[PDB]
Design a protein around this ligand. Structure first.
Ligand SMILES: CCCCCCCC/C=C\CCCCCCCC(=O)OC[C@H](COP(=O)(O)OCC[N+](C)(C)C)OC(=O)CCCCCCC/C=C\CCCCCCCC
Ligand SMILES: CCCCCCCC/C=C\CCCCCCCC(=O)OC[C@H](COP(=O)(O)OCC[N+](C)(C)C)OC(=O)CCCCCCC/C=C\CCCCCCCC
Ligand SMILES: CCCCCCCC/C=C\CCCCCCCC(=O)OC[C@H](COP(=O)(O)OCC[N+](C)(C)C)OC(=O)CCCCCCC/C=C\CCCCCCCC
Ligand SMILES: CCCCCCCC/C=C\CCCCCCCC(=O)OC[C@H](COP(=O)(O)OCC[N+](C)(C)C)OC(=O)CCCCCCC/C=C\CCCCCCCC
Ligand SMILES: [Zn+2]
Ligand SMILES: [Zn+2]
Lengths: 505, 48, 146, 48
């Protein structure tokens, strides 16, 4: 949770707006509260015994999700260490035979056992992810949909852009009975109906949201409670096909779930060919935090890197055109005079030759093509070689190096800016630390006791958990504002000290 | 109370009610109110 | 002191004491603090380079074995991807130090059924190992200075 | 240098008003005061 808070503060300070700061903070608080509920749920304390055992097993997997991932990485490293002892031969231990070359003779059984363990651990990782992190994904999706419905009329007064796939897919869940399954607000449909019923028609809204006013009224008037005994048939009738389809679409669009599924698929392919287990070594990028940061350095300017490679390709193509038109005779790469091996006898071949050999040459294409001394085109061709070396080898590779170095510098600067902001001004009210430090450690006391972010999140959790009939006056005020998504109750440029400066002094 | 009554008119004309501040002839800061055209507003919003 | 004592056993152990310039000279200490500022990241970068080169070794061992003959006389071949350990050593030792990568050292693929696959192999090796990862090391040192 | 110039532009636009040059701290004495000042009181688009 501390890591989540750090990431949230970084994101808000770096790519956040002042107007949306409190909206982002409240969304972060809601996500943290839901994660806390999940953590409490999974924390540890014939059909019934089987059910309780299944729940305990799933809770164990969710608790040890990260340990399972580290175990998978360790197993992959062990498998690849064993694979380092692999050898090829012509005779059993035209056709070529691959086999382990080990003296002790224990490596082949160990490899098979480790591969089986790795596949099992990958499957367990998938299950643990589904039980631990998918709920938050569904919660965020559902709450965003509910807010868009209530405060934007995203399917009432306006429609999805039709290029945004998320809105089109979300259209599937509107009328499902269990649409708000993870998001705690169970009155979303009623709120939307009361908000947009008059302008766009109560019947139309009810049809869109899959609710029946006549049934609501009849249930209110009288009570009928037919409850069949629990059973497989009852459960099957209970399941909600449309909602499950929408949920599985969301899950299969989730990035981390896709990565874990690919991990499992590669683990399965490892049993077809052991060398497919080498793909799992790529997991160090996701697993090790230092490596993840280093690689974020590279991916920070990834678009610019790709465009730079494209520009290099275009420039090399221009050089290829010039060579194909004027310097064809210098591209013979054959020593025997009987059989020439020309490279600029066709444009495709010469472009391949340039991009493949000249770019990798230390001095450029001149390192590889024939020496031009004593030729009518000697000066033209030395200019050709020198400009190739300067523009391709020196300038463009310098651009790539500079992009990586600038990514490092930019990330460092962003971290420093976040730290400076958090040390200089209060995250909530925005008042500078100089005003608060008029009293000893005033800013520290203000950020620890007066405008504490954790305290605001705890208050939100307490308000949500408390029954509305028990709210005090202030709690009712804040609850109403929270329901309306009005963040004016958050102090902004004001505090208790400023409010009562005269009396407090 | 008057503003509450006129809320609908004010809401309708909000995008077209431009206001600026100038140092006026009275040697004081003054607020000037004027009309913005819909075509001008759309052109300003154009991405280029 | 221990190295000084060993210097009497063999005079060349006194060469170890030249390493003391790092501790003694303030300018050198600052310059080397530049390198050690991101030492953990440098070590992890070397590890990532090792892993990437291992993946390239796996691909070469599985598909490009015939291009790794480093013998001129036809009677006695000297293959490098005839076993994974040998070919991983060959990659990490020769390809990383080659200016253009492993393509500088392994056989020319012109006129082969796998020519395009193998030129992609060489070009990606050059780009990811020689250009990017070394650029990462240089950038770590420069960022330490900054 | 280009990155630094962009950052300086962003910091200036977030810290002081482009027209009057008064810092955002004075305006933020009221809730979202600087935002309201730059959106309604001293709006560049409104001057144009
Ligand atoms: C998140 C990133 C997403 C992208 C990941 C890309 C992963 C790369 C690979 C493969 C594509 C997946 C689907 C391929 C399945 C084809 C099936 C196949 O393959 O069947 C042909 C042979 C199988 O073997 P066999 O015929 O001898 O029969 C063995 C047993 N019997 C004798 C029963 C007959 O294939 C072989 O041998 C395979 C030999 C081993 C090949 C090297 C393993 C991959 C290792 C490193 C490459 C890393 C690339 C990373 C991508 C860039 C991301 C930045
Ligand atoms: C980021 C920058 C990208 C760089 C792009 C590529 C840079 C490559 C640079 C330099 C090469 C310099 C030498 C170019 C020409 C030398 C040959 C020459 O001079 O022979 C005189 C010819 C004789 O004709 P012919 O009978 O032999 O063939 C006629 C018909 N055919 C051609 C198929 C049979 O006269 C003629 O044809 C006249 C034909 C018109 C000449 C067009 C050449 C334009 C190329 C580059 C301009 C700038 C290069 C110098 C500055 C460096 C770049 C900054
Ligand atoms: C605080 C940081 C610590 C990191 C540095 C640690 C130091 C690394 C080195 C050595 C540890 C030695 C421990 C074992 C020594 C056993 C003795 C031995 O070894 O006796 C074998 C031969 C001696 O000669 P002999 O048999 O002819 O007997 C001649 C006399 N009679 C004629 C009696 C027969 O050994 C020889 O010859 C030795 C020839 C000289 C070898 C080069 C000396 C070191 C020079 C440069 C490298 C410095 C290391 C820097 C790397 C880390 C920096 C980050
Ligand atoms: C940071 C990133 C790290 C980079 C990781 C290393 C990337 C190295 C990249 C590229 C090399 C491209 C060429 C790879 C394959 C060419 C060979 C081919 O095409 O032969 C087709 C075969 C024919 O079957 P066969 O008769 O030879 O039996 C094979 C049974 N055995 C294997 C023991 C005898 O079909 C098959 O086996 C199908 C087998 C499945 C293919 C697995 C190879 C996948 C390797 C890399 C992923 C994509 C590379 C391009 C992306 C650039 C990197 C970003
Ligand atoms: Zn505060
Ligand atoms: Zn102003």
């Amino acid at each position: 949770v501390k890591e989540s808070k750090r990431q949230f503060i970084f994101d808000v300070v770096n790519e956040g707006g002042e107007s949306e700061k409190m909206e982002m903070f409240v969304s972060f608080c809601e996500d943290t509260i839901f994660e806390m509920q999940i953590a409490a749920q999974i924390s540890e304390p014939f059909w019934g015994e089987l059910e309780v055992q299944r729940v305990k097993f799933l809770n164990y997997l969710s608790r040890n999700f990260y340990t399972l991932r580290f175990l998978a990485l360790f197993l992959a490293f062990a498998i690849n260490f064993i694979l380092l002892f692999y050898k090829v031969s012509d005779s059993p231990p035209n056709m070529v035979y691959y086999f382990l070359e080990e003296s002790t003779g224990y490596m082949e059984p160990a490899l098979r056992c480790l591969s089986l363990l790795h596949t099992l651990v990958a499957f367990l990782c998938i299950i643990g992810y589904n039980c631990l992190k998918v709920p938050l994904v569904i919660f965020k999706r559902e709450k965003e949909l509910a807010r868009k419905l209530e405060f934007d009329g995203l399917y009432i007064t306006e429609q999805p852009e039709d290029d945004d796939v998320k809105g089109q897919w979300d259209r599937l869940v509107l009328n499902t009975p269990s649409f708000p399954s993870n998001y705690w607000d169970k009155f979303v449909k009623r709120k939307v109906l009361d908000k947009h019923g008059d302008i766009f028609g109560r019947e139309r809204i009810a049809e869109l949201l899959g609710m029946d006013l006549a049934s609501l009224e009849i249930t209110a008037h009288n009570e009928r409670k037919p409850d069949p005994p629990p059973g497989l048939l009852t459960w099957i009738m209970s399941i909600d096909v449309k909602y499950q389809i929408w949920k599985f679409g969301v899950i299969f669009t989730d990035n981390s779930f896709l990565y874990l599924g690919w991990y499992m698929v590669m683990s399965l392919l490892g049993h077809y060919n052991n060398f497919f287990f080498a793909a799992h070594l790529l997991d160090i990028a996701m697993g090790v935090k230092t490596l993840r940061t280093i690689l974020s350095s590279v991916t920070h300017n990834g678009k610019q890197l790709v465009m730079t490679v494209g520009l290099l390709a275009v420039v090399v193509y221009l050089y290829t055109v010039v060579a194909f038109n004027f310097f064809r005779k210098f591209y013979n790469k054959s020593e025997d005079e009987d059989e020439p091996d020309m490279k600029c006898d066709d444009m495709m071949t010469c472009y391949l030759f340039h991009m493949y050999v000249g770019v990798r040459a230390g001095g450029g294409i001149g390192d590889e093509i024939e020496d031009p001394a004593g030729d009518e085109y000697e000066l033209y061709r030395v200019v050709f070689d020198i400009t190739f070396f300067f523009f391709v080898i020196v300038i463009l590779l310098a651009i790539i190096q500079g992009l990586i170095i600038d990514a490092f510098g930019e990330l460092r600067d962003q971290q420093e800016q976040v730290k400076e902001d958090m040390e200089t001004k209060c995250f909530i009210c925005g008042i500078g630390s100089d005003y608060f430090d008029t009293t000893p450690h005033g800013f520290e006391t203000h950020t620890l006791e007066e405008h504490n972010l954790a305290n605001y999140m705890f208050f939100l959790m307490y308000l949500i958990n408390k029954d509305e009939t028990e709210h005090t006056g202030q709690e009712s005020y804040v609850w109403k504002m929270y329901q309306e998504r009005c963040w004016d109750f958050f102090p902004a440029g004001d505090c208790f000290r400023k409010q009562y400066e005269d009396q407090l002094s | 109370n008057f503003l509450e009554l006129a809320e609908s008119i004010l809401e309708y004309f909000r995008p077209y009610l431009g206001r600026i501040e100038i140092m006026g002839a009275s040697r004081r800061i003054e607020r000037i109110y004027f009309e913005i055209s819909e075509t001008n507003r759309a052109q300003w919003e154009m991405p280029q």
